[PDB]
Amino acid sequence: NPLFSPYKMGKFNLSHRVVLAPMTRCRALNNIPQAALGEYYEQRATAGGFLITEGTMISPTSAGFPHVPGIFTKEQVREWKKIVDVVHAKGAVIFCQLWHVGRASHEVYQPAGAAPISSTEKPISNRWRILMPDGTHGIYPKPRAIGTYEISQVVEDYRRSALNAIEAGFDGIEIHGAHGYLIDQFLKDGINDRTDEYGGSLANRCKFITQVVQAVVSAIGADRVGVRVSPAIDHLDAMDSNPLSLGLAVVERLNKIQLHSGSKLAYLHVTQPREEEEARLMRTLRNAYQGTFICSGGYTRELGIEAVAQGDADLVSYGRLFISNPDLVMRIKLNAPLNKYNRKTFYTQDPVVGYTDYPFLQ
Ligand SMILES: Cc1cc2nc3c(=O)[nH]c(=O)nc-3n(C[C@H](O)[C@H](O)[C@H](O)COP(=O)(O)O)c2cc1C
């Protein structure tokens, strides 16, 4: 089984290729990590296994979901440390995903009911709806288009949160630059309509992600930074006219950051729009990137084995199957049946129901 051949992810010696994909679960009440997160991540921790946390707030303006954790406060750092400890107690490697939603928010999630921030003043269309704190679905508002100074301050929020994650004991961080959120709102020419140095050309559209990644690299070292992108996923009206060139332009700047800093990133992480043409886009981005590649999106045990065996990826991250199967790594090793996941409790607040009560194998 190629999923269980060991892999050297830079400085981290992983024992298998099964990764916990980052998943927002909304149990971090009041943006503070709760003990429930500790039990949840510990249930899925394995010796030499790689975990990525739910999207974590870098700022008071970075949320678009309820009860999502942050790492911009000393209290959040203090509470994240107890979770990192129980995870490292089982020998797992864990990264904190740094998440800013951009325009994918609502006044209910913003301090003083302010408008969310974005590259543009264009809102998400009402084809998409935002989960409200009360379980209803609300309307995405008009965002505020920020100047270049405010762009540099957001880069600083990424930089400070990366240092906070290291203080909490995380082995590294993942930059969430996918799924139509803040960074992707700069990348995709379907969203980025700016006429300054952050809009227009493909080079200008990649400036924001380059500056974010360079800032966390120089802060904690390239070998502790992962980067997640999704060029071909139109989530939240996040289309690009040339998804492959967009992905290749992004990949090239990661390669240059590695050459500049003289060190390789932890990995590049790409979700795919889960047909053969979409598989070719992943392999094209894989072949272009000088380092570790993590593939994600609709993967199974068989597709994951097939990805690693054919060189399509070095690591495979699983989302929904990891919700319902805490011992997904053990089940996949034994080729044991997988349990179904409850969609209704993906984003609920209960610290147990649909979060930690999925049973292990008999
Ligand atoms: C409930 C849920 C929450 C998710 N939260 C995040 C997130 O916070 N950040 C992120 O980059 N991806 C997030 N994802 C996407 C996953 O990281 C991953 O791309 C996806 O689950 C892979 O598809 P799979 O379920 O077939 O494994 C989430 C997915 C689900 C189902």
Numbering used by the authors: 10 to 283, 298 to 384, 396
Give the authors' words.
Jasmonates are phytohormones that are pivotal in mediating plant responses to various biotic and abiotic stresses and regulating plant growth. The first crystal structure of OPR3 from tomato (SlOPR3) showed that the enzyme crystallized as a self-inhibitory dimer in which the L6 loop, a critical loop involved in substrate recognition and coenzyme binding, from each protomer intrudes into the active site cavity of the other protomer. Based on these observations, it was postulated that the formation of the self-inhibitory homodimer represents a mechanism for regulating OPR3 activity and, thereby, jasmonic acid biosynthesis.
To test this hypothesis, we crystallized wild-type SlOPR3 without ammonium sulfate. We found a condition that produced high-quality crystals without sulfate, using sodium tartrate as an additive instead. Most of these crystals contained the enzyme in its monomeric state when crystallized at a protein concentration of 10 mg/ml. In some cases, crystals of the monomeric and dimeric forms were even obtained from the same crystallization drop, corroborating that both forms exist in an equilibrium in solution. While collecting data for our previous study, we observed that in the presence of micromolar concentrations of weakly binding ligands (e.g., NADH; dissociation constant = 1.4 mM), the enzyme crystallized exclusively in its monomeric state, indicating that the monomer–dimer equilibrium is readily modulated, which also argues against a physiological role of the homodimer.
